[PDB]
Design a protein around this motif. Sequence first.
Motif, PDB file in Angstrom:
ATOM      1  N   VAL A 291       0.805  -1.214   0.000  1.00 57.16           N
ATOM      2  CA  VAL A 291       0.000   0.000   0.000  1.00 57.16           C
ATOM      3  C   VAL A 291       0.844   1.272   0.000  1.00 57.16           C
ATOM      4  N   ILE A 292       2.114   1.195   0.397  1.00 61.04           N
ATOM      5  CA  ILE A 292       3.002   2.348   0.426  1.00 61.04           C
ATOM      6  C   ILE A 292       4.348   1.944  -0.159  1.00 61.04           C
ATOM      7  N   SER A 293       5.114   2.949  -0.580  1.00 58.65           N
ATOM      8  CA  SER A 293       6.430   2.730  -1.165  1.00 58.65           C
ATOM      9  C   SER A 293       7.562   2.865  -0.159  1.00 58.65           C
ATOM     10  N   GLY A 294       7.264   3.232   1.082  1.00 58.70           N
ATOM     11  CA  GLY A 294       8.273   3.260   2.121  1.00 58.70           C
ATOM     12  C   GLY A 294       8.147   2.059   3.032  1.00 58.70           C
TER      13      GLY A 294
ATOM     14  N   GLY B 193      -0.428  -1.484  -8.898  1.00 63.80           N
ATOM     15  CA  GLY B 193      -1.579  -0.706  -9.306  1.00 63.80           C
ATOM     16  C   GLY B 193      -1.245   0.614  -9.962  1.00 63.80           C
ATOM     17  N   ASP B 194       0.008   1.054  -9.900  1.00 63.46           N
ATOM     18  CA  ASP B 194       0.405   2.290 -10.558  1.00 63.46           C
ATOM     19  C   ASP B 194       0.351   2.134 -12.073  1.00 63.46           C
TER      20      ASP B 194
ATOM     21  N   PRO C 199      -1.669  -1.417   9.144  1.00 61.84           N
ATOM     22  CA  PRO C 199      -1.806  -0.287  10.067  1.00 61.84           C
ATOM     23  C   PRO C 199      -2.549  -0.670  11.336  1.00 61.84           C
TER      24      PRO C 199
ATOM     25  N   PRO D  21      -4.380   1.786  13.718  1.00 59.40           N
ATOM     26  CA  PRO D  21      -4.791   3.135  14.123  1.00 59.40           C
ATOM     27  C   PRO D  21      -5.034   3.229  15.621  1.00 59.40           C
TER      28      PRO D  21
ATOM     29  N   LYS E  36      -5.387  -3.824  11.097  1.00 55.69           N
ATOM     30  CA  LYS E  36      -6.312  -3.882   9.975  1.00 55.69           C
ATOM     31  C   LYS E  36      -5.687  -4.661   8.828  1.00 55.69           C
TER      32      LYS E  36
ATOM     33  N   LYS F  78      -7.442  -5.149   5.858  1.00 56.34           N
ATOM     34  CA  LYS F  78      -8.101  -4.794   4.602  1.00 56.34           C
ATOM     35  C   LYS F  78      -7.140  -4.263   3.544  1.00 56.34           C
ATOM     36  N   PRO F  79      -6.201  -3.354   3.847  1.00 55.04           N
ATOM     37  CA  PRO F  79      -5.268  -2.915   2.794  1.00 55.04           C
ATOM     38  C   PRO F  79      -4.461  -4.048   2.184  1.00 55.04           C
TER      39      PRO F  79
ATOM     40  N   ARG G 108      -5.615  -8.641  -3.891  1.00 57.34           N
ATOM     41  CA  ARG G 108      -6.614  -8.704  -4.952  1.00 57.34           C
ATOM     42  C   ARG G 108      -6.127  -7.999  -6.210  1.00 57.34           C
TER      43      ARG G 108
ATOM     44  N   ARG H  86       4.230  -5.770   7.230  1.00 53.43           N
ATOM     45  CA  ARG H  86       5.040  -4.784   7.931  1.00 53.43           C
ATOM     46  C   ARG H  86       4.156  -3.975   8.867  1.00 53.43           C
TER      47      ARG H  86
ATOM     48  N   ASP I 230       8.934  -3.133  13.314  1.00 49.67           N
ATOM     49  CA  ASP I 230      10.007  -2.152  13.410  1.00 49.67           C
ATOM     50  C   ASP I 230      11.053  -2.629  14.408  1.00 49.67           C
TER      51      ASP I 230
ATOM     52  N   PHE J 230      13.984  15.360   5.983  1.00 51.30           N
ATOM     53  CA  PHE J 230      13.859  13.948   5.646  1.00 51.30           C
ATOM     54  C   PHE J 230      15.109  13.231   6.138  1.00 51.30           C
TER      55      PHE J 230
END
Lengths: 556, 556, 556
Positions: free
Chosen positions: C10-13, C151-152, C183, C185, C192, C194-195, C201, C216, C245, C310
């Motif tokens: 879901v993320i690139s990091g 997906g990109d 994640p 939250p 969760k 779902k992501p 999928r 992760r 982590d 950063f």
Amino acid sequence: MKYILVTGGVISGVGKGVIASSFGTLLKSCGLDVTSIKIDPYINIDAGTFSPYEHGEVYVLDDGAEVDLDLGNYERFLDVTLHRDNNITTGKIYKLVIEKERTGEYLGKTVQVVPHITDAIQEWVERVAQTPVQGSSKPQVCIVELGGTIGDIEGMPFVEAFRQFQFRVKRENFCLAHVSLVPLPKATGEPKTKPTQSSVRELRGCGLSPDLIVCRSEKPIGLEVKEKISNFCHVGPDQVICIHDLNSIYHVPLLMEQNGVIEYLNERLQLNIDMSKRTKCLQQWRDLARRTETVRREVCIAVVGKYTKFTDSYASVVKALQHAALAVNRKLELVFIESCLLEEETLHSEPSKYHKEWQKLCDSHGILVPGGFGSRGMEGKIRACQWARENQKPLLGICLGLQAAVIEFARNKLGLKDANTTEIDPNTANALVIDMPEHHTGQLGGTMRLGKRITVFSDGPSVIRQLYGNPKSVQERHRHRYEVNPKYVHLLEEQGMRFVGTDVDKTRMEIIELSGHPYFVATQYHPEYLSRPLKPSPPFLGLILASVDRLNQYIQ
Amino acid sequence: MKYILVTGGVISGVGKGVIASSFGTLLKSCGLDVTSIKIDPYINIDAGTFSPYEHGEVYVLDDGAEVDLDLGNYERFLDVTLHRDNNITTGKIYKLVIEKERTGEYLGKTVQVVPHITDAIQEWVERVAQTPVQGSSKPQVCIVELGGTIGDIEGMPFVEAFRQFQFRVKRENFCLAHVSLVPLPKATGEPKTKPTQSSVRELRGCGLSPDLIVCRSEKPIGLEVKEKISNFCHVGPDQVICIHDLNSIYHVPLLMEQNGVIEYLNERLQLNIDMSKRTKCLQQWRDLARRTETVRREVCIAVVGKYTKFTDSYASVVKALQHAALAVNRKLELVFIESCLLEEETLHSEPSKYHKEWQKLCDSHGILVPGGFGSRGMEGKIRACQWARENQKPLLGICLGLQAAVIEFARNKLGLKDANTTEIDPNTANALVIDMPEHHTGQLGGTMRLGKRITVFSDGPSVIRQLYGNPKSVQERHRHRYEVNPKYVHLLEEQGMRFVGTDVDKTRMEIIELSGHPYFVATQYHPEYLSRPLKPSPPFLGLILASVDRLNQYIQ
Amino acid sequence: MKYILVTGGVISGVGKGVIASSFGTLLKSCGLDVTSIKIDPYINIDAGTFSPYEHGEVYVLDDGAEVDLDLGNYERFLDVTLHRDNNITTGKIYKLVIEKERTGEYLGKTVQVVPHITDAIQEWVERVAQTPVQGSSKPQVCIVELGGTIGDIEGMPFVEAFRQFQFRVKRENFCLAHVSLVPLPKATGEPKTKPTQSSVRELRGCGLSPDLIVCRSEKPIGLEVKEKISNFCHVGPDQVICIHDLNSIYHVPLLMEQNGVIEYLNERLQLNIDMSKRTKCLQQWRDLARRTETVRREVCIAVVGKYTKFTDSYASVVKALQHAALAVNRKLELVFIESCLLEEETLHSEPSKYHKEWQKLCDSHGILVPGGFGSRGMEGKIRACQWARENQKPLLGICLGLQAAVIEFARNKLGLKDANTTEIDPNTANALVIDMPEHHTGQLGGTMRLGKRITVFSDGPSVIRQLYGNPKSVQERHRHRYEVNPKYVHLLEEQGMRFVGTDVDKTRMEIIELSGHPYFVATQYHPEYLSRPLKPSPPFLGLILASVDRLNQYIQ
Ligand SMILES: Nc1nc2c(ncn2[C@H]2C[C@H](O)[C@@H](COP(=O)(O)OP(=O)(O)OP(=O)(O)O)O2)c(=O)[nH]1
Ligand SMILES: Nc1nc2c(ncn2[C@H]2C[C@H](O)[C@@H](COP(=O)(O)OP(=O)(O)OP(=O)(O)O)O2)c(=O)[nH]1
Ligand SMILES: Nc1nc2c(ncn2[C@H]2C[C@H](O)[C@@H](COP(=O)(O)OP(=O)(O)OP(=O)(O)O)O2)c(=O)[nH]1
Ligand SMILES: Nc1ncnc2c1ncn2[C@H]1C[C@H](O)[C@@H](COP(=O)(O)OP(=O)(O)O)O1
Ligand SMILES: Nc1ncnc2c1ncn2[C@H]1C[C@H](O)[C@@H](COP(=O)(O)OP(=O)(O)O)O1
Ligand SMILES: Nc1ncnc2c1ncn2[C@H]1C[C@H](O)[C@@H](COP(=O)(O)OP(=O)(O)O)O1
Ligand SMILES: [Mg+2]
Ligand SMILES: [Mg+2]
Ligand SMILES: [Mg+2]
Ligand SMILES: [Mg+2]
Ligand SMILES: [Mg+2]
Ligand SMILES: [Mg+2]
Ligand SMILES: [Mg+2]
Ligand SMILES: [Mg+2]
Ligand SMILES: [Mg+2]
Ligand SMILES: [Mg+2]
Ligand SMILES: [Mg+2]
Ligand SMILES: [Mg+2]
């Protein structure tokens, strides 16, 4: 009629219910009449057969329907009396369409999803939106919340139905708010917009487009993240609303107002809301938020519940306790105590946890025993009730708590060491709590004593009767399937207890009280479902006052 | 257990049913036992409430269930007796799951699509695949046909269920054949592979992969097109099967064999089919195809039906007529005549069409009046029946044809000019055809006299009794809701008619015959549902023999 | 040849680079030869024109190519010498295909994406995988990392190419590891899944399937979450690997080993890795992780850098500092100091931040001035260099740090108050740092002094010459475009400074040193690119030793 659709982003705990409730609160502050429809893509007819872990506590409506806690949030933030038809499930729609087809309404053509299921969904939404919900009030805005997230196989009929619906009622009557999550991983250290971009892309592929993008995060995101979201979602910079984790949910309407949600909705939906009059509209909520921020005195209540691992399994209970605590200018310190760890078996397995939980229970000013199902953790409830009755600690039991109190009273005072419920021990020599004959037809789901009933106060001075306002009879909502044995009640009443709450037939007793002990009140019904931010439930208020040693002062 | 899934390409009339029937025929030629399951993604419980235009003629099973014509194709090509559970619809699965949830089987968790609906679909497929269908035979291969095309919102649960199913039963037990269309536009002039590529891409996005690609076209495609399909679909060159429009559906099994389908399925599904013994396996079908190619003598039958605009609305009737025509070495000329155009109203509107249809009806050796619903075209059926009875033209009426014949007989011979059915004229002075009291409970769909029954032959020499083999009673399948009036039957039989077919109670009469006219037989039931390629229906065979003037020779 | 594909969730990091580096480390521990290919779906030919904020610090290879920091991670964890062809970008592939088409290689047919771009990608991967990278070693496993997330629009050609590639080289040679984020939250309070389900999928819709699911999160997830992921992703319970982590990235290989990644890859990819010999394989990494856990003595180094916002913009710098700190049994306390806040302008705007940063700089045992581009923050670098030279605080300047040191020396000691670089002040009376004439052809991107060069040590006793090992000349990688003016260097050398590092021509000087001050060393090249966990860079080691007051002891 105007419609607002609130859809989900990457997770289903993102906060759609709070966003929809805040939309309703803002729109009712202006002066409009707001309806609320909850769409549950699951196939269960109602929520009467859910575990509290799956989605949270199960709400009971006025007509007996068991619904999600989202309807409870709607009733709490809007002060409206919802009906069974304000919850839409896949099972309801499919059963309706199947019955219609079998009767012969769709004669000649095959029944499909797009032309028939979606049409039934749209007809249901249009018919329910116009149903009066606060009396004779004709609604003006309907807020529809879509359960789950965009992209689920269960939500495809509903997203297709709303894609047709936005053109059926024109775009000026239809708005769509999308709630997404913006994670900030500790290792990465920067907010990530990619999940929101993927959610927006999926929603656009489904044929819809978000008028609003509500970004949910734990801490406020920088302007770079918001600008990135606006650029990569094809949404205006001022059309992205950032809601972070707040102290209480009362701040969400204020946050959305300071983000200019009301003005955008008034221009987008042509609500014709005038700016001049609507000043100091959220004064009740601002006052409540300030009171939540400015409560110093400490009140501690221990919840001996078996659904502690999930904090939302006692949503209505916690909300009623918070309302009562705020009504007396006290800060509610809530300690959740798993009733399993209070049993002697835990002592032989985890002595450290057993002692920790017992000392957590011993340092609280009050105890609450809510309801529940099953046999796990019930002995811990008995132990907590026994300790509270012995050491004069105020206690309030709900449903299963009343049965636990009766079991403890019979086992200790009456000496019947074999006392137990038929729910747990069907082969009981002294079945203190038995089954109601008409609620065990072998069909679980909408078959208990459900909805509003009538509770008769017994002829005799009882402080619980005072707490409600010294009435003759009161109405409450019931979610019980077992009831105590009349014969033992005759014995228990004589010994030390006073059954001060029964029904009209004087056969189903509901409220018990004891001489001596300052505050030991147990209820068969759920007083929590009728609690509102300005109307705390009298049982919870009495429990708080007895915990903080102010009940006697409040009596006079 | 081995499973073959046949999915759809760009259109739903591509030929999935014929492909599945040919798969079953090939697998039964080897010696295996083959089941057939038809999956209809629509929500109708059964097909008893369909228009013949929507998908074709509605089949009636042995137990009374009304199903698609695909089950008729299965029974015709496989000679098996299917059941109600061999048809799967969305309504069936959803009703099953809803009832299970209401009873309490899914207690504790929410009922969803992916974990529950798909599980119910898989359990249904696994349970039905093992149900004996030809007697005590234990099936070995199940052929599942997915109605519709890949990508529909209705088929998503089924494609997801089969995506899990292929891994539940391992890939060695599961095969997937994809049937696609290769259009050859006249303006463009070249076969186009893009729709097949899009269908394959959609199927791979759904999580499946076609083991076979069946390309359907009107004329054989070149090797360039086949190579392009193999390259752009990631499928082997020999793994793509080209089926073009053939003279009869009997050539499809032979075409797929000459394309080596049996060998590929034997290696892919590990059927352990031996090559040496299976020689001359399709001798019946090869002989039938040769006979269809080599029939010279001409027989013409005119069908006075109201569903002429769609040629598949009389599928079973046409197939029974073809079987009877082939059983006597005759080429069947089928002229479809809309019964509406035979009414005098058409004469005042389109005289040219009226005269054209009347001269089409006048140049035929025989007439057939099949069943139907509604009042449109019924007067044309009366006119055709009247002309046939007057001019000694052989005629066979089915269901509604029997009522039309009774109406004509009463109106003309008995003089009751007001004779009509209650279905069309409820306020009738002489209600010649009335309603059966127990089949009008206000619930359309599975409420008529459905399924096998018993028909009693009357005591008296009748040629229709001979045609079946001179029995005492016979069993047939019924799809009627109205029946003739007993009192007028007493008058009608006296005048010129012989009611030679009734039930055990001798109250519900089924077959009529009249002295004089060579062949004028009408049936209340449907004889076409029991017709097989080697077992032509005796009524249709008698009609053909009387049309070609050979009935008397066949009698002796 | 065996291939491992690492894709994004879901993320690139999320940590794909660390996962791929750990895969390479584990496979090289067994004894295999491992290649690494980084795929960057962006269109830039190289990374020489990137901001450090976009993806991090820009790496310089041995041949002059500027690549992502992922190649630096590969070289650090694998100790291999990568080439320009180990980075694949969209621009590279498209330029290659366009040049081939223009030359005439694709004559006759149109050049498309699926048949041509994907074929070029596959040919590039196959050709580069076989290129020797550690000398004469023939590689055995190639690890391909796909930049971005699934997906990109940019990654579609690469996912399609790998979907064909898995069948081109058979499934036994191809494996796919999917890294996703789970994640947790704070408001929701539960992990969760779902992501991850949505990512799986999407990957299945793209035609691929994850052999491994690397989840992760920040804290370890419960077994319920892992079981949910296994159920809803159609992946085995032991095929889901949870990486949380950790304190350092050295624990990731150990974590994946204790999760049994090596065994699963050996069985899945048929690596034929023997279990008996491979004992104590990660002893170097286990020792390094223990040393990172067990370093007590404190060493503080302040980084006066302009890319502080950063933390990954100085990845190689931080890694070299950590290697040097671990090589002397010291715990590196890294304080990042924005050079902008050390300027006098910040004093007139934010005095509190100015004083805070100055006192952060004043309490450090050493200072480091890395490189950079632009004029922002350069005056702060001058101020930090001036303070360090005045108060005898050890300092190490890199590239831009050397120019800042020369500017400070000329402005203060030589009195030339107008000294400045042509990069910032082209109209300079005393252009202390000027431009190299051959690196300003108006074409940014691969046009500086790039790659390995030769640095000549001047004839004279210098401690920096000792630190490297008292050689005559050394080789390092350069990323500079401007160089100091020779004429002023003649003056500066006389006054107080010693230019002890030049090139063969004795015209381009690289290293400066000063008499007096204990450790004031500045380099024109980047010593950080040659640092390995067991081979700390001698400049950083000397800086650490001087900071902790141990340089003199290490000299003798
Ligand atoms: N156990 C039970 N649940 C009922 C009944 N009637 C409605 N429900 C609902 C409430 C429960 O939340 C749900 C059952 O799911 P659970 O197994 O999680 O209930 P329970 O609280 O007993 O949890 P547990 O099994 O003891 O761990 O069905 C009933 O008669 N018995
Ligand atoms: N009209 C009618 N249809 C029934 C009945 N029972 C089951 N069905 C089915 C058969 C029909 O094919 C379908 C109705 O669709 P249609 O309107 O096309 O029937 P019909 O043949 O009368 O066509 P029409 O309306 O006259 O043009 O419902 C019934 O009692 N009356
Ligand atoms: N400014 C600059 N960047 C170059 C040059 N040659 C290659 N590059 C790269 C390095 C930089 O990271 C990137 C330019 O992007 P930035 O605007 O972020 O660079 P800079 O460090 O100056 O940031 P800044 O503009 O001062 O905030 O181009 C050059 O000659 N000048
Ligand atoms: N802005 C906010 N700040 C703090 N807590 C919030 C919040 N929005 C929601 N919450 C809390 C309330 C709920 O218990 C939970 C989210 O669930 P919810 O609001 O019912 O949405 P959903 O219906 O999508 O689950 O988190
Ligand atoms: N290969 C072939 N050659 C000629 N006609 C064919 C054919 N395959 C099918 N047909 C005919 C028979 C059917 O009436 C019609 C296609 O419908 P079908 O075979 O039932 O498939 P579906 O179930 O996909 O509609 O065309
Ligand atoms: N398991 C883990 N524990 C702690 N830090 C991690 C980690 N995996 C990665 N990191 C750190 C290292 C990187 O700086 C950052 C993730 O970036 P990365 O590892 O290069 O992956 P990507 O290439 O997907 O960005 O977080
Ligand atoms: Mg929820
Ligand atoms: Mg909700
Ligand atoms: Mg959940
Ligand atoms: Mg239970
Ligand atoms: Mg069809
Ligand atoms: Mg079919
Ligand atoms: Mg159609
Ligand atoms: Mg009709
Ligand atoms: Mg990265
Ligand atoms: Mg990387
Ligand atoms: Mg980014
Ligand atoms: Mg710049």
